[PDB]
Amino acid sequence: GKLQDVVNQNAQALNTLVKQLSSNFGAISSVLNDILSRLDKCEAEVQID
Amino acid sequence: SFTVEKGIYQTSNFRVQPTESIVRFPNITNLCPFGEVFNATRFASVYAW
Amino acid sequence: GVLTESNKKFLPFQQFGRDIADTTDAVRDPQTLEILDITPCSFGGVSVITPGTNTSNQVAVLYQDVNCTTWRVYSTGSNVFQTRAGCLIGAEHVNNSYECDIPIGAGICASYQTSQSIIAYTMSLGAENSVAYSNNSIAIPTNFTISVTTEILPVSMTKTSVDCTMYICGDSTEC
Amino acid sequence: AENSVAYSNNSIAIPTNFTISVTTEILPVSMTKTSVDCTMYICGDSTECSNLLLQYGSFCTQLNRALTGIAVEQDKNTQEVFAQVKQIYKTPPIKDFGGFNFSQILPDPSKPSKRSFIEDLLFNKVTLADAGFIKQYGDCLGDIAARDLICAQKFNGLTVLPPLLTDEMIAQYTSALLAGTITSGWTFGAGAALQIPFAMQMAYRFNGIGVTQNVLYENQKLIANQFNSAIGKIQDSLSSTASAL
Amino acid sequence: GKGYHLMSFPQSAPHGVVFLHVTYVPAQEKNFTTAPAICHDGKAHFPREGVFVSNGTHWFVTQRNFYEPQIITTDNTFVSGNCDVVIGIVNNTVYDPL
Ligand SMILES: *[C@@H]1O[C@H](CO)[C@@H](O[C@@H]2O[C@H](CO)[C@@H](O)[C@H](O)[C@H]2NC(C)=O)[C@H](O)[C@H]1NC(C)=O
Ligand SMILES: *[C@@H]1O[C@H](CO)[C@@H](O[C@@H]2O[C@H](CO)[C@@H](O)[C@H](O)[C@H]2NC(C)=O)[C@H](O)[C@H]1NC(C)=O
Ligand SMILES: *[C@@H]1O[C@H](CO)[C@@H](O[C@@H]2O[C@H](CO)[C@@H](O)[C@H](O)[C@H]2NC(C)=O)[C@H](O)[C@H]1NC(C)=O
Ligand SMILES: *[C@@H]1O[C@H](CO)[C@@H](O[C@@H]2O[C@H](CO)[C@@H](O)[C@H](O)[C@H]2NC(C)=O)[C@H](O)[C@H]1NC(C)=O
Ligand SMILES: *[C@@H]1O[C@H](CO)[C@@H](O)[C@H](O)[C@H]1NC(C)=O
Ligand SMILES: *[C@@H]1O[C@H](CO)[C@@H](O)[C@H](O)[C@H]1NC(C)=O
Ligand SMILES: *[C@@H]1O[C@H](CO)[C@@H](O)[C@H](O)[C@H]1NC(C)=O
Ligand SMILES: *[C@@H]1O[C@H](CO)[C@@H](O)[C@H](O)[C@H]1NC(C)=O
Ligand SMILES: *[C@@H]1O[C@H](CO)[C@@H](O)[C@H](O)[C@H]1NC(C)=O
Ligand SMILES: *[C@@H]1O[C@H](CO)[C@@H](O)[C@H](O)[C@H]1NC(C)=O
Ligand SMILES: *[C@@H]1O[C@H](CO)[C@@H](O)[C@H](O)[C@H]1NC(C)=O
Ligand SMILES: *[C@@H]1O[C@H](CO)[C@@H](O)[C@H](O)[C@H]1NC(C)=O
């Protein structure tokens, strides 16, 4: 189990990194395409920031 | 996950829900001078406001 | 929150008091000129002791920092035992001492044993045996055994690389 | 201090006496196990804030996973340091170790805890922030006048979990280690404990450091007196200063 | 590994290593009565390596970690001083080759 812990920890860290892409972080949406499709270049920059 | 392995897990601290709501405002009943402020026969100049 | 009587003396020009976190502590009641202390009503940690959900659906709740000797507990039920780590509800205390299975804390462990149920007990440090020490007695071995023990050590971990432009801005030129 | 040392190709300095020196070394083993509640810290009691925080559940799971790993690590640290032997040896009722006195570093039966004298001094010389792990809601509600820091921490979701092994139990482990060491030497570590007289054990130890075992026997009383004096010196030192720990 | 270490074998595991520590664990302890030294002709004898034991009547010198008793002999022990200062010394004869 001491080595399976290492393997599982690395895999879980990468999976958590993938999961964390669903946060808005204050933006109107968590998806670049939605922001770029409903907002013009003007405030899409603010949200993408 | 729908499956929990054997062990001890910390959960959210003990929550107590509010049983009732109260509102405490100062004991005053006079209406504000809306008539004297908005229904004024004579407004002042902008330079001497 | 909970409002209680306060011994604080507000100056005539003050209406609120505040923590070092700038959250409101005390308030001068606007109707009757008294100071009321405000406190949160959520307080105290909670832990859930469970065997595997495939093993059983029962759970024992450890309410830290509550004395069970009404209560700030979700449900009392039966088997309410005051451990040193807190108030354990849903586990049957036993006078035996086994090896630790689920460490509750403060020297208390829990296990799932037989009608199956969750039991809580003080762990056993080990077998208690003395040695016949004397000023003129020595124990010498007359035989031996060759024991092969296994020791596992991690040496490395997965080498990872990350592309910013493709994680943050996946296929977006403006991004 | 500058100290030139005389050197020659046909001169050697040989010791003609010795001192038995008892030194103290202090090592941290664990730190406080701590748990954090995002909801109760970030979003005190507002439901709107918790609803907004719902999308950072992955971040909070990461935080609490790291803290749980730290807590398990602390428990493992204490267990590996102190649970070297799973045989709880107890000292014999008669204390005849060839003039060596172990009263200060052995359990005191006339105390609620089985800590030794030195252990009592050590536990008195460190002021724990918590000094317990039961802080009831009534107590924190009844000391609003006093700005207690533990209550302020706990009203923001920051709790300190109790260690798995209590101080009495770690004291039991240490007492077992002392009993095994003085009654059997190093054998109790390398399998079953083998009894040996303490004078003969110390003779083995002296033979280990490259001096013949006789010199202990021709100086057993002097060596015992030196050991007792050094133990007393340690006892006095720990009871005077505060920077030792 | 526990016990006195004899020798270790390495093995590879994914992201790690496994050591098979072969060690020597003493097995069957037996009680004996012992003394730090023995007075022979007013002079004390101490083992050069070993320890004095006795099965009740006779006194032998045996190695530390294995019961291999040997007759007390001048080549098994060494002499240093008279036999009064030593605490716990006993009386016995020290054989000599002849
Ligand atoms: C020392 O221990 C070993 C085993 O731990 C003993 O060897 C065994 O002796 C019995 C006697 O018939 C045999 O049946 C076993 O097959 C032996 N086991 C092995 C692995 O060989 C040995 O006899 C003991 N020696 C002494 C002096 O006690
Ligand atoms: C080695 O040093 C010790 C002191 O640490 C000597 O022991 C002292 O000897 C004098 C002789 O008068 C006594 O007054 C002291 O009471 C002794 N002190 C202790 C703690 O025993 C010892 O004599 C020295 N050894 C030799 C061979 O000189
Ligand atoms: C070992 O050192 C102690 C110093 O405290 C000697 O004195 C005893 O100390 C204990 C403390 O645990 C007391 O309970 C006793 O009343 C003390 N007895 C005396 C005569 O002072 C102690 O005597 C020393 N050990 C031996 C065998 O002498
Ligand atoms: C070893 O042999 C000597 C022989 O002299 C013993 O010395 C005598 O012991 C008795 C009893 O203590 C005394 O009454 C005599 O005065 C001693 N005579 C001499 C010359 O010393 C010695 O006691 C024996 N050792 C042991 C442990 O019994
Ligand atoms: C009216 O105001 C006064 C002082 O502000 C207060 O004492 C009194 O309680 C108030 N009346 C009622 C019915 O609360
Ligand atoms: C303000 O003036 C108009 C016209 O006289 C009147 O109808 C109205 O009631 C007045 N409102 C207030 C608040 O005085
Ligand atoms: C749970 O127990 C069942 C047997 O009752 C077994 O089939 C299953 O593999 C177990 N699952 C886990 C995660 O242990
Ligand atoms: C509160 O908990 C402590 C923990 O031992 C206990 O000693 C005490 O008795 C409890 N309070 C009361 C009134 O029993
Ligand atoms: C456990 O031991 C205590 C003290 O002897 C006793 O009061 C209690 O009845 C025992 N309980 C059980 C289930 O044995
Ligand atoms: C040695 O003596 C003690 C006390 O008589 C006894 O308990 C122990 O079993 C003896 N050792 C062996 C190997 O029999
Ligand atoms: C002790 O060992 C010797 C030689 O092996 C033997 O002659 C003697 O009978 C033994 N005595 C006892 C009490 O075992
Ligand atoms: C060893 O202990 C016994 C009883 O405690 C005693 O009679 C004997 O004199 C002691 N032997 C030595 C060398 O002190």
Residue D192 CA, chain-centre distance (Å), reads 25
Q: Whose CA is nearest to atom 16 of ligand 2?
A: D222
Residues 6+ apart with CB under 8 A from C87: C62, C63, C66, C67, C68, C71, C73, C80, C81
Give the Cα separation of E46 and E90 in Å (integer). 12
Tokens of D64: 């609490």
Place of tokens 């003493």: E26
Write out the H or E segment, with its range, that includes residue C168. helix C164-168
3-state SS string for chain E = CCCEEEEEEEEEECCEEEEEEEEEEECCEEEEECCCCEECCCEEEEECCCEEEECCCCEEEECCCCCCCEECECCCEEEEEECCCCCCCEECCCECCC
C-alpha distances (whole Å) from E79 to each of C43, C94, E47, E76, E86 are: 76, 62, 9, 11, 12
Residue type, D20: I
3-state secondary structure of C106: coil
Query: CA torsion sign, C21 to C22 to C27 to C28?
Result: positive
- Name the region of D157 (left: φ>0; alpha: ψ -120 to 50; beta: rest): left
Place of tokens 């533990």: D150
In DSSP notation, C27-73 reads: EE-SSS--EEEEE-S----EEEEE--TTT-S--EEEETT------SS
Altogether, the residues listed in chain C come to a count of 175
Give the Cα separation of D217 and E82 in Å (integer). 12
C-alpha distances (whole Å) from D100 to each of D159, D177, D198 are: 46, 17, 9
- Give contacts of E 31-50 with C, CB under 8 A: 31-35
What is the distance in A from the centroid of ligand 12 to the CA of E88?
8
Residue from D91, D118, D232 nearest D175 by CA? D91
> Cβ contacts (< 8 Å) between E64 and chain D: which residues?
204
Q: Catalogue the long-range contacts made by D199-206 (C-beta closer than 8 Å, 24 or more residues apart).
A: D199/C135, D199/D97, D199/D98, D199/E36, D199/E87, D199/E88, D200/C138, D200/E34, D200/E36, D200/E51, D202/D98, D202/D100, D203/E36, D204/E64
Q: Report the b/e string of A20-46 with b at 16+ CB within 10 A.
A: eeeeeeebeeeebeebbeebeeeebee
The dihedrals phi and psi of E87, each to the nearest 5 degrees, come to -95, 130
Place of tokens 């200063």: D241
Give the Cα separation of C129 and D198 in Å (integer). 19
Angle at which helix D117-124 crosses helix D220-238, to 10 degrees, equals: 20
Report yes or no: C164 at the A interface, CB cutoff 8 Å: no
Angle at which helix D167-184 crosses helix D117-124, to 10 degrees, equals: 150
For this entry, resolution in Å reads: 2.9
Asked if C141's CB is within 8 angstroms of E65's CB, the reply is: yes
Give the Cα separation of E68 and D70 in Å (integer). 51
Q: Does residue E21 contact residue C166 with C-beta atoms inside 8 Å?
A: no
C-alpha distances (whole Å) from D220 to each of C175, D98, D232, E10, E86 are: 82, 8, 18, 46, 8
3-state SS string for chain D = CCCCCCCCCCCCCCCCCCCCCCCCCCCCCCCCEEEECHHHHHCCCCHHHHHHHHHHHHHHHHHHHHHHHHHHHHHHHHHHHHCCCCECCCCCCCCCECCECCCCCCCCCCCCCCCCHHHHHHHHCCCCCCCCCCCCHHHHHCCCCCCCHHHHHHCCCEEEECCCCCHHHHHHHHHHHHHHHHHHCCCCCCCCCCCCCHHHHHHHHHHHCCCCCHHHHCCHHHHHHHHHHHHHHHHHHHCCCCCCC
Residue type, C158: T
Give the Cα separation of E1 and D191 in Å (integer). 11
3-state secondary structure of A13: helix
Q: Does residue B13 contact residue C46 with C-beta atoms inside 8 Å?
A: yes
Tokens of D163: 């260690």
CA angle, C157 as apex, C156 and C163 as ends, to 5°? 135
Burial environment of residue D218 by CB neighbours within 10 A (0 to 12, 13 to 18, 19 or more): middle
Give the Cα separation of C150 and D189 in Å (integer). 18
Residue type, D104: Q
Residue C68 CA, chain-centre distance (Å), reads 17
Number of neighbouring beta carbons within 10 Å of residue B28: 8
Q: What is the longest distance spanned by two Cα atoms in chain A? A: 53
Give the Cα separation of E61 and E68 in Å (integer). 8
Give the Cα separation of D184 and D192 in Å (integer). 9
- Give contacts of D 126-165 with E, CB under 8 A: none
Q: Does residue D92 contact residue D198 with C-beta atoms inside 8 Å?
A: no
Give the Cα separation of D167 and D52 in Å (integer). 43
- Name the region of C86 (left: φ>0; alpha: ψ -120 to 50; beta: rest): left
Give the Cα separation of D132 and D135 in Å (integer). 8
- The DSSP call for residue C19 is -
Mutate to test the pocket of ligand 4, among E43, E91, E92 (most ligand atoms within 8 A of CB): E91
- The alpha carbon of residue E33 is apart from the nearest alpha carbon of chain C, in Å, by 5
* A interface with C, Cβ–Cβ below 8 Å: 2-3, 6-7, 9-10, 14, 17, 21, 32-33, 36, 41, 44-45, 48
Give the Cα separation of D31 and D237 in Å (integer). 25
Q: Whose CA is nearest to atom 8 of ligand 7?
A: C54
Tokens of A10: 């690395």
Q: Report the b/e string of C119-149 with b at 16+ CB within 10 A.
A: bbbbbebbeeeebebbbeebbbbeebeebee
Edge-first strand order for the sheet with E16-26 is C144-154, E16-26, E4-13
Residues 6+ apart with CB under 8 A from C169: A32, C175
The dihedrals phi and psi of A39, each to the nearest 5 degrees, come to -110, 145
Residue type, C161: S
Q: Report the b/e string of D166-200 with b at 16+ CB within 10 A.
A: beebbbbbbbbbbbbbbbbbbbbebbbbbbbbbbb
Residue of B nearest to C40 (CA): B16
- Name the region of D39 (left: φ>0; alpha: ψ -120 to 50; beta: rest): alpha
Give the Cα separation of B5 and C53 in Å (integer). 7
Count CA atoms within 13 Å of residue C12 on its CB side. 0
The dihedrals phi and psi of D170, each to the nearest 5 degrees, come to -65, -35
Q: Does residue D51 contact residue D87 with C-beta atoms inside 8 Å?
A: no
Asked if D64's CB is within 8 angstroms of B13's CB, the reply is: no
What is the distance in A from the centroid of ligand 12 to the CA of D103?
20
